[PDB]
Amino acid sequence: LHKEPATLIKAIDGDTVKLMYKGQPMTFRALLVDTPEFNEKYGPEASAFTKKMVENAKKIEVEFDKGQRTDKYGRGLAYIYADGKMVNEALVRQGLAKVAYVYKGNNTHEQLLRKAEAQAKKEKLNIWS
Ligand SMILES: Cc1cn([C@H]2C[C@H](OP(=O)(O)O)[C@@H](COP(=O)(O)O)O2)c(=O)[nH]c1=O
Ligand SMILES: [Ca+2]
């Protein structure tokens, strides 16, 4: 896989963000995770966590996996990086997302994110408390 440049347009919630990619606005949905919706427990915290991560970043990148790059809602499906740190992994490590939506061919970082979930769980963090 390889990282490509993108620019923040707007935070949306824990696992979606609006980014300018190859000069076009698109909503990106974070691969391999699921944050609570804003109306659910930890949802506001998930939203706040991702917002700080992307808004503070001097550099956002997106990394597509090997399979589909758009979901059925027209959202980009990627791993999203903020100054080199993967949002997807960071959410999971903080117990603010579960590993989820693991589809064949788009699962390159599955074991990485699983390892993070295991540690969040060990630490009884947030969703796991
Ligand atoms: C993360 C992801 C979600 N989706 C689809 C599955 C779910 O369809 P359904 O909407 O029909 O339940 C939806 C969940 O995304 P959200 O968790 O943002 O709601 O997005 C994909 O198709 N591929 C993906 O990689
Ligand atoms: Ca969600």
Is 114 catalytic? The answer is: no
User: Can you say whether the dihedral through the CA atoms of 34, 39, 42, 43 is positive or negative?
Assistant: positive
Task: Estimate to the nearest angstrom the gap between the alpha carbon of 109 and the chain centroid.
Answer: 12
For ligand 1, mutation pick of 72, 103, 104 (most atoms within 8 Å of CB): 72
- Name which residue sits closest to atom 20 of ligand 1, judged by CA: 71
CB within 8 Å of 115: residues ≥ 6 apart: none
User: Can you say whether the dihedral through the CA atoms of 122, 89, 53, 34 is positive or negative?
Assistant: negative
Atom of ligand 1 nearest to the CA of 34: 17
H or E segment at 110? helix 110-122
What structural domains does the chain harbor?
Answer: 1-129 (2.40.50.90)
Atom of ligand 1 nearest to the CA of 103: 25
